[PDB]
Ligand binder design. Structure first.
Ligand SMILES: *C(=O)[C@H](C[C@@H]1CCNC1=O)NC(=O)[C@H](CC1CCCCC1)NC(=O)c1cc2ccccc2[nH]1
Ligand SMILES: *C(=O)[C@H](C[C@@H]1CCNC1=O)NC(=O)[C@H](CC1CCCCC1)NC(=O)c1cc2ccccc2[nH]1
Lengths: 301, 305
């Protein structure tokens, strides 16, 4: 029993982190086979922050302008190319610690683990979710760029995020491992603002199911709702719409607990109206939205 | 910026986990040098949960009664002995992935990372605190016994916890790696209950400092207090007493933020007596007590291992 925000074990990713330096900029790179992936803004200088022409900047670089270090060993860059907003540095040696892996682009509401790194070495590991507005609420300082987010279902590592920047409101933006940003952001230091953050409704419902599984029932009620009436209410609290896909996805948890999905929606509606009245759910006094239905099933069984 | 409940990177520990099976029971072991450590209750049968004399049951057991598997390779057990509530199985080969390590016993209020494992395979990692009542509020299912808790300092892994059991209230109990239980618990099938828990005051204060460092400042005020005055309020609200050592340890954070400890104590006193009035701190609607002062320092300065 118990319920914790649980990350994946980080060892398979730790063995892939390296340090990449270009000019005076140092950040992290991901070394898989004979390629090191890192944010392309490592090639920017202090005058190229607003409107960098990355194709023009990259063509001027030599292989030896990139210093790549794995532990106390320099890797020799033998080639470079850019794919969207990531740089791919070809090196002369394959990483012997490369795990089984794939690159996956995730949808808002999906969760993943982040291995926060500085100078190629790990600082710590934590869980994150892709917010509906395509930001993540991370913990990242200067030098963290190039840290990755990942899931490890099975023994396969699915890389889904690479860190690039912090928006003025304190949240974070980045790309997939093909170099495409999540959301409308660009790798320029120009004024950019994320959409209004909303709550990930299907994840709140998953977490209420987790609470029942762990023995807690105080928030249940005798009512039900239609899906359309639920959405009319939840949007007034800046909750994301719940779709029929979401209802289908909660079928398994509904079957395990004997609580129909639309009956749990009626519980959530009352919680939004009443608050918690000095109570907690799974040790929280707010409704958590960073556990997916899949996460709940992994942890509770 | 930002602030998250952050676990230590687990790679150094993952390479030490193995599976240990005795009779019908399977759980995890920790393989360091040429010894595998696991809970001694692995030896119990259904007719020994009630009241077992493990020292008598261990004589009856022979080396080949312990199946140890590291991945798909079987380790050969060449000896066995007990240390308190931990079984030590000597194996014929040293773990080539053994990290620099030591065994340490932690104090209540200290935090550590748990590598939850099943069948010898690491499954997830999260940060815990040793509660004042000597339990931990973990997430553990059947087959997780022998999962371990650890801290890392530079290149050194300090192992501090091995998991043994779940109490009726759903919190968890275990031992250090020399097999001494944390708290007034025993490894017998019997009625056991956690003591009433209290909140870790020095950790709440550290987290309030983390909040200010991240620009969350609504709870600060003009007032200050004394230790005696504060501690009288603490006792009233089931908070752990705040000592002078605690004030000293927060010293850094006080100087960095310009909020003296007793100044921040006056903030915490008001939060206790008045609550949060519908506001949050670092995304929480409760006062969080599972970050130590050192936890805050290393997250806010980007310390690596
Ligand atoms: C890479 O290591 C950092 C990671 C940042 C530092 C603070 N927290 C983080 O997550 N990335 C940056 O510093 C980028 C660099 C830019 C180079 C040119 C192309 C765009 C990215 N900058 C920022 O994240 C940045 C600058 C800035 C100024 C004012 C407010 C916010 C802000 N964020
Ligand atoms: C080891 O893998 C498990 C871990 C437990 C399973 C559920 N959650 C956990 O953390 N440990 C056990 O199952 C122990 C075994 C005992 C054998 C005899 C010596 C003491 C340990 N049992 C329990 O944890 C247990 C039994 C029990 C009965 C009623 C309420 C709670 C309860 N916990």
């Amino acid at each position: 029993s118990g319920f914790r925000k649980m990350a994946f074990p980080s060892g398979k990713v730790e063995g892939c982190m390296v340090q990449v330096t270009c000019g005076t900029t140092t950040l992290n790179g991901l070394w898989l086979d004979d390629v090191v992936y890192c944010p392309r803004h490592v090639i920017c200088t202090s005058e190229d922050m607003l409107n960098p022409n990355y194709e023009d900047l990259l063509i001027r670089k030599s292989n030896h302008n990139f210093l790549v270090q794995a532990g106390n060993v320099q890797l020799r860059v033998i080639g470079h190319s850019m794919q969207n907003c990531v740089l791919k540095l070809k090196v002369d040696t394959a990483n012997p610690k490369t795990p089984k892996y794939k690159f996956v682009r995730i949808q808002p509401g999906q969760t993943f683990s982040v291995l926060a790194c500085y100078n190629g070495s790990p600082s710590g590991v934590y869980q994150c979710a892709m917010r509906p507005n395509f930001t993540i609420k991370g913990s990242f300082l200067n030098g963290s760029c190039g840290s990755v987010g990942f899931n490890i279902d099975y023994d396969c590592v699915s890389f889904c995020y690479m860190h690039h920047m912090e928006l003025p409101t304190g949240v974070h933006a980045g790309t997939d491992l093909e170099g495409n940003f999540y959301g409308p952001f660009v790798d320029r230091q120009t004024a950019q603002a994320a959409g209004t953050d909303t709550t990930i409704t299907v994840n709140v419902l998953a977490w209420l199911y987790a609470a029942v599984i762990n023995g807690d029932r105080w928030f249940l009620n005798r009512f039900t709702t239609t899906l359309n009436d639920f959405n009319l209410v939840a949007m007034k609290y800046n909750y994301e719409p719940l779709t029929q896909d979401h209802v289908d996805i909660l079928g398994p948890l509904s079957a395990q607990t004997g609580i129909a999905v639309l009956d749990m929606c009626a519980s959530l509606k009352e919680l939004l109206q009443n608050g918690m009245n000095g109570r907690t759910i799974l040790g929280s006094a707010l409704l958590e939205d960073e556990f997916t239905p899949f996460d709940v099933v992994r942890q509770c069984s």
